[PDB]
């Protein structure tokens, strides 16, 4: 328009862009149509597997995971899948880990099949975030 | 204007309003100026106490807490304060509890004084949310 201003909405995008040598998410990489087609294929081909996308909570200080797409046996429990993720990122047992579905911590005795049927995304994947504890950069 | 529509922004407010016999938050109850004055008074009068507001994560199925404002000794650790909250809501040890500061889980060996100096609100209080595990209404 006529006036202008340092757009506070854009400033985080500029700051994030300057730190590029891209950790884009599964949803940012693939259209909704493509994700829907893919999850339908997975469910047709592997009826007892739940397609899960695992991503670190944005900004968490825990190490990132090398693999984000998992075809998980439906009878695996939340606790068991948490152990699998812990093994994948090699987080020592003494350090806590947390899984989040819809920004809450799923009860650990639920199966991934239960959680999938109730909490799957519109695109047919179950999205699971993980983090550790936050030290806020303080002396622990 | 000229046109109209069932405002999706307002519909959750209508639905929430119909469930009234009000669980408003500390910030919703008190102006920013009043909160700033009060926390400054607390810090002047009790130099080794951190003023903490404890509130259940919105929508969590865990029981609500009867008391939200705490003047916590600064050398109390996060783990110890979690135990205090657990006692206050009488949550059995077998059920998990989580504390959140700025939407993350604070490291359990930090003191409330450390967490206060780093993560206090602009209004001078430390805001701590708590929840349990989410069963998503499923059979546990």
Author numbering:
A (entry chain A), B (entry chain A): 1 to 21, 26 to 144
What's the paper's own text on this?
An atypical LIR motif from SpHfl1 (LIR[Sp]), which binds to Atg8 in yeast, was mostly localized to GABARAPL2- and weakly but significantly localized to GABARAP- and GABARAPL1-containing autophagic membranes. Isothermal titration calorimetry (ITC) experiments further confirmed the strong and specific binding affinity of LIR(Sp) to GABARAPL2; the dissociation constant (Kd) of LIR(Sp) to GABARAPL2 was 0.24 μM, which was 8–12 times lower than that to GABARAP (1.8 μM) and GABARAPL1 (2.9 μM). We successfully determined the structure of the LIR(Sp)-GABARAPL2 fusion protein at a resolution of 1.86 Å. The structure of the LIR(Sp)-GABARAPL2 complex is similar to that of the LIR(Sp)-SpAtg8 complex. The SpHfl1 LIR consists of an α-helix, from D391 to M404, and an N-terminal tail. The helix formed extensive hydrophobic interactions with V51, P52, I55, W62, and I63 of GABARAPL2 using M394, L397, Y398, A401, and M404. Among these, Y398 formed the most critical interaction, as it was inserted deep into the L-site pocket of GABARAPL2. In addition to hydrophobic interactions, three acidic residues of LIR(Sp), D391, E393, and E395, formed electrostatic interactions with K46, R67, and R28 in GABARAPL2, respectively. Although most of the interactions were similar to those in the LIR(Sp)-SpATG8 structure, F388 of SpHfl1 was not inserted into the W-site of GABARAPL2. Among the GABARAPL2 residues involved in the interaction with LIR(Sp), W62 was the sole residue that was not conserved in other mATG8 proteins (F, K, or S was also observed at this position).
